[PDB]
Amino acid sequence: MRAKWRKKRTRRLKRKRRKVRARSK
Amino acid sequence: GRVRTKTVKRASKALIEKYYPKLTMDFQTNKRLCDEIATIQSKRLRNKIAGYTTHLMKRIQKGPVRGISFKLQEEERERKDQYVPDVSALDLSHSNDVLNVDTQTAELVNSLGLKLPLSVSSVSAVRDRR
Amino acid sequence: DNSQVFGVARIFASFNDTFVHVTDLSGRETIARVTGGMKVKADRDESSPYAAMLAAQDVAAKCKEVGITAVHIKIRATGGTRSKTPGPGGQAALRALARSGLRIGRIEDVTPVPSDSTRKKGGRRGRRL
């Protein structure tokens, strides 16, 4: 693994969860 | 691919060192010599030693060289390095009697408090690139 | 002058398909546009010296037919953004022009060079062949 891409995956998860929260409100 | 290995080289070199007065430039004569005067078990090794010794004979007669230093060459160097010329070539005599110096060396001589006949001259201190 | 008919060879030598394109002193009227690819079959040895040599020989024949004897060569590379470096064919074309009867004079390096213009092709890490 290369920490760049792990951070990219984590930020993708962050974006997905933030969009879910925005749709929830 | 024949390179005349260490043993033959050292044996022939020692033969040179100890026997050069009694050696010639002819392969057959040195072959008979080295067979009679140095115990060699095998004929092939004897012949190789004789060949290398003859090659070194031709080399030495061509001129004294590295490594080989026997009695005659050492005596020649002894009588040749004891060479002493005539008057010392400094002697205040050669190169326009009363030799040239520089002003700073002149004042060294003056500060020493000795005579040391002198001839002052500047330097034109320009530093050439060269 | 010795009653000579001057011309300009002005070779353009990229790393592929060396060009030989002679014109008059005014530079506008073209003679013998035949190039390296004209005289080779592979379409990939165009940069090879053979293509340039045959092109130069045919140019020389055309020049002898039209009267231009002495030449003023202007060697050019692609230059500009691309590598600033002369191609291999153009020099052989120049030599072939030299052999075949014609005369030379004032060979020039007319490589177009920029003063850092043109953010150019390749990307950050560049070619990755």
Binding site: - | - | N2, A70, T85, A98, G101, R127
Partner: protein, 102 residues
């Protein structure tokens, strides 16, 4: 580990340097770590200097030369034989390799 004291860059006090593009591989690279060779060359080789000479008016021409300053990358330079991987104790010798033609 510290491979080279000068970091193999030769910047050491500039912060940032303007990038330059490689001649062959077109890689952007800091201009100091952009190994550079002054390709100063005669416009034709000796195999054609004669050929041009007898086919030349203006006898004894100056035969003008072509100059260029190749700014390689490092990958092309090591691949295209310009720079050679030398031994550890020989890295610290920065003089050109002993008078190419003597």
């Amino acid at each position: 580990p510290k491979k080279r004291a000068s970091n193999g860059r030769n910047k050491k006090g500039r912060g940032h340097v303007k990038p330059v593009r490689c001649v062959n591989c077109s890689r952007s690279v800091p201009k100091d770590k952009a190994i550079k060779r002054m390709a100063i060359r005669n416009i034709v080789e000796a195999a054609a200097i004669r050929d041009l000479s007898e086919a030349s008016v203006y006898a004894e021409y100056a035969l003008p030369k072509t100059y260029n300053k190749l700014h390689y990358c490092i990958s092309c330079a090591i691949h295209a034989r310009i720079v050679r991987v030398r031994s550890r104790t020989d890295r610290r010798i920065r003089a050109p390799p002993q008078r190419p033609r003597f």
